[PDB]
Write a protein that binds this ligand. Structure first.
Ligand code: B12
Length: 596
């Protein structure tokens, strides 16, 4: 029989004879009077088997993508006959019937200002494997375009993705706009920057229709099936409503229960250094920017941290095999991890040897001094105490009250730079790297129909950007700044943060203000030197880009600012010479007080 062959090819992921079997079944008009039967019947049966096996955890994500590719080739062979049948019937009967076999239509988009779509692509493929008609809209999607896509495609669900905290404001804007046209379509929320608490507190109240946060792609199928089943729709919505009300009440009680120090008191208990006895800062080999136009990708292959790459494919090894290279020894996901790693190495070799990917970056150093909570940068030949700063990076100090038994100070990034009045020269660095050509390769793979290769190339581009950042930080410590000239740590120690100094990035918990990237881009001329541009929400395009600041102090360390009070917001607005509303917008996730 041909149905068994179709199901076996779908489940196992064999495109070798899928065209032949599909054509053979199509020619068997006895079983299938219309080609819709080959879709509604044997083909979606294998897709459903794959989807439920993935939901149960027996089959892993890469095999799901293989099955999706096989199904895509099958439907691609079938769609000319679908078009022929529809064109014939439009003239024979004058009408087009409801021939939809999918469970529902879902508009899937990444909100404006965000350029990350690996998770959105994975979610779309997973949903498509469960007979959902996924409508992927891309990145930096305007809200009006999402609403128009939902209206034109008679969509049933809308999904929003976002990776940076400025995307949360866009998501809330989309929710309230959906409310403004009185749309009743359920709205799912996903992304690395999203959380269950933020959705119920901020996103959920703005929309009357269901708004559900989804942690991963596996839960997305369950949520969509429950939302599209009328026997479970209202009860699931009510349960979501009660749990979100409970979490909102708990959130407000907590917010009443937190204590914060006064800003002056927090400053008085900040981190201190003995600059009169600590070793003096090491002057960099140059003051200004050194631009890299075409970095050696082969040097970046051995600097790649593969654990986030295996986290992309959801191949999470159990203890003690939870990380590379021990993941290959795991009983369950060892074979799939090995297959994915081999494919990644093959594609990396092909792209590097063909010059299909280019890495560009810039690193700069300037004299820097500290004035309370700010780091001021000066010219090369200018005396810091008698010259105007050419740039300033404003820091945020931890304000949340700590445990009485705790003795840790209240950290700020300016604590790692020598104060101006101390009479000690100090310097600060910054960098920005990227991997160029991932977008075109992903588009080419998606046009062919290989979503697996597109996801692989996106993950490899991100890995290459991270490896470039790590290697450049290694060079800065030993060669360009030479404050750690005796460093000889291996890449394993590099991934363990065992070296001197730190490289905080804007938007991270050390300094969660994304507007710090504008100063770097204006100072180091990053967009003109390397081609990396900031979007409207201060995200780096291409998405395979990493930036940050270089702190060479021995005592410097990574810290989380946490929640801050109103007074720190007012002081930050006064220092930055911007309105309080802008500070609250760019520091919304770290506000310890309500704003509405
Ligand atoms: C490696 C990594 C990167 C990658 C991002 C990977 C990518 N492009 O997908 C890169 C190298 C680009 C990077 C850069 C930066 N990152 Co980053 N990064 C990480 C990290 C460690 C991995 C998370 C991740 O992306 N996994 C990959 C995908 C598969 O996971 P996911 O997006 O969560 O997708 C899943 C689910 O969320 C869900 N899902 C996703 N979308 C949708 C949509 C719908 C509808 C549904 C139903 C489900 C759904 O399904 C997916 C499958 O599981 C996280 C830490 C963390 N724990 O989240 C930080 C994190 C996401 N990074 C963040 C930040 C700070 C940045 C930067 C701004 C820092 C910088 N260099 O300036 C830049 C971004 C600018 C840029 N580069 O263009 C923040 C978030 C923003 C913030 N705090 O303001 C995080 C959370 C770190 C942090 N603690 O602050 N980073």
């Amino acid at each position: 029989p041909v149905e068994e062959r179709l199901e076996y090819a779908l489940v196992k992921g064999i495109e070798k004879h899928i065209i032949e079997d599909t054509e053979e079944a199509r020619l068997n008009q006895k079983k299938y009077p219309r080609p819709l039967n080959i879709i509604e019947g044997p083909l979606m049966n294998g897709m459903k088997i794959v989807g439920d096996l993935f939901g149960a955890g027996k089959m892993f994500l890469p095999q799901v993508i293989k099955s999706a590719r096989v199904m895509k080739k099958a439907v691609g062979h079938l769609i000319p006959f679908m078009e022929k049948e529809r064109e014939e019937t439009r003239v024979l009967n004058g009408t087009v019937e409801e021939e939809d076999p999918y469970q529902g239509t879902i508009v899937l988009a990444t909100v404006k200002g965000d350029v990350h779509d690996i998770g959105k692509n994975i979610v779309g493929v997973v949903l498509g494997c469960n007979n959902f008609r996924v409508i992927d809209l891309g990145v930096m999607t305007p809200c009006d375009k999402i609403l128009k896509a939902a209206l034109d495609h008679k969509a049933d669900i809308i999904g929003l993705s976002g990776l940076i905290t400025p995307s949360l404001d866009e998501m809330i804007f989309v929710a309230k706009e959906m409310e403004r046209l009185a749309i009743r379509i359920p709205l799912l929320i996903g992304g690395a920057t999203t959380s269950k608490t933020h959705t119920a507190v901020k996103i959920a109240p703005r929309y009357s229709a269901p708004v559900i946060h989804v942690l991963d792609a596996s839960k997305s199928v369950v949520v969509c099936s429950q939302l599209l089943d009328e026997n479970l729709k209202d009860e699931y919505f009510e349960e979501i409503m009660e749990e979100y009300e409970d979490i909102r009440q708990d959130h407000y009680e907590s917010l009443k229960e937190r204590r914060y120090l006064p800003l002056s008191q927090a400053r008085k208990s900040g981190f201190q250094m003995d600059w009169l006895s600590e070793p003096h800062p090491v002057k960099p080999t140059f003051i200004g920017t050194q631009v890299f136009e075409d970095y050696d990708l082969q040097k970046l292959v051995d600097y790649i941290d593969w654990k986030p790459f295996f986290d992309v494919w959801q191949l999470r090894g159990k203890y003690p095999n939870r990380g590379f290279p021990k993941i290959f020894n795991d009983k369950t996901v060892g074979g799939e991890a090995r297959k994915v790693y081999d494919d990644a190495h093959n594609m990396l070799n092909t792209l590097i040897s063909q010059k299909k990917l280019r890495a560009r970056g810039v690193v700069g150093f300037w004299p820097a001094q500290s004035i309370q909570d700010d780091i001021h940068l000066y010219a090369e030949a200018a005396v810091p105490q008698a010259a105007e700063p050419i740039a300033t990076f404003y820091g945020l100090r931890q304000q949340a009250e700590k445990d009485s038994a705790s003795t840790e100070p209240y950290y700020c990034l300016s604590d790692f730079i020598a104060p101006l009045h101390s009479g000690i020269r100090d310097y600060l660095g910054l960098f920005a790297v990227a991997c160029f050509g991932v977008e075109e390769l992903s588009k080419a793979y998606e046009d062919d129909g290989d979503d697996y290769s597109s996801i692989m190339v996106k993950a490899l581009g991100d890995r290459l950007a991270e490896a470039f950042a790590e290697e450049l930080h290694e060079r800065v410590r030993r060669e360009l700044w030479a404050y750690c000239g005796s460093e000889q740590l291996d890449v394993a120690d590099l991934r363990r943060l065992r070296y001197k100094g730190i490289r905080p990035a804007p938007g991270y918990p050390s300094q969660p203000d994304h507007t710090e990237k504008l100063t770097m881009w204006r100072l180091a001329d990053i967009e003109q030197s390397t081609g990396i541009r900031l979007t409207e929400s201060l995200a780096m395009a291409p998405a395979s880009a990493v930036s940050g600041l270089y702190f060479s102090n021995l005592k410097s360390k990574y810290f989380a600012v946490g929640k801050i009070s109103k007074d720190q917001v007012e002081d930050y607005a006064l220092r930055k010479n911007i309105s309080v509303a802008e500070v609250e917008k760019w520091l919304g996730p770290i506000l310890g007080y309500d704003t509405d």
